[PDB]
DNA sequence: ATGTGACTTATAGTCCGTGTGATTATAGTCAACAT
DNA sequence: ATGTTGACTATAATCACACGGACTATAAGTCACAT
């Protein structure tokens, strides 16, 4: 569907391995549902700033640090 | 609000002006009503990415020159 | 497969509701995963006593409670 | 161990004694091996209900008076 | 008769994830009128 | 030109649940040897 979703879903998830953590402990401290980080990785889906905000603060990861693997992220090939 | 949303809106708006585009312009470029886009930059709007992206195609910018930008304007 | 087990089955998810608990709730105070309360209530999963005993704690109902309710189930048309 | 098992398994060897039975016999009975029947007794078994369910066939008892006793048996 | 121990094998119970209908909050989009 | 106020409607986001596969702990079932 859409280009820049799927990178950030695909930095969501690349994090949450990273830092050791499972969905359900990323959608506490997200303080978002459950069913809500399963569904941002397995498919994607269009979450808002502010929500993406919250995963960033629950992956434990500074706005810039997400940001700068962002980039590194859609600049792959 | 969100700091974020706030620094994400004001990008928007110093892209759409080093670019001397208006608001009319920046909505009629990326298919989108102008009174969203004028909320965004007053930051009266919590944008989805495919709405940020939107946003993006319409500023013609590539996803990561506005994150460059979106990262210096967070470092003060 | 086993007739106890559904009645048993049955009646965990009778309390469980009556109490106003959801599953998460439940496997939360049994400390089991919601998955197994889900299992247990869906096919009426084959438990052990010390689990179904968890189980009763979790519910926040006592033994003799429980075997009341279970009698009540069994015996009924 | 746990309160309810010992009872539960006290109350499987009061049937089986207020019968008249002997473990082996249990055992035959409801299809089971008699080391397990034992270490139930001596309550060193954590059965699941299918279990309890084929030792109340081999007591021949229904579930409803295992569990009128059990409930007896549980309050001292 | 019953009670051990110790030794496989079935399965109970755990852990991490997928996928889904139904409801609630809210972004997406577009009016009218402002300046 | 940009700002603001309501609106309607799409959909983001929530909440309670089902379902699967893989792994770990342990109950199920059977030996040998006590007594």
Known sequence: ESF???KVSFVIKKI????????????????????????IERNSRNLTIKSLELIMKGLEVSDVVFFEMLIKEILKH
């Open 4 to 6: 820049l979703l799927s």
């Open 16 to 39: 949450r391995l990273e830092k050791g953590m499972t969905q359900e402990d990323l959608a506490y401290k997200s303080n978002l549902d459950r069913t809500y980080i399963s569904g």
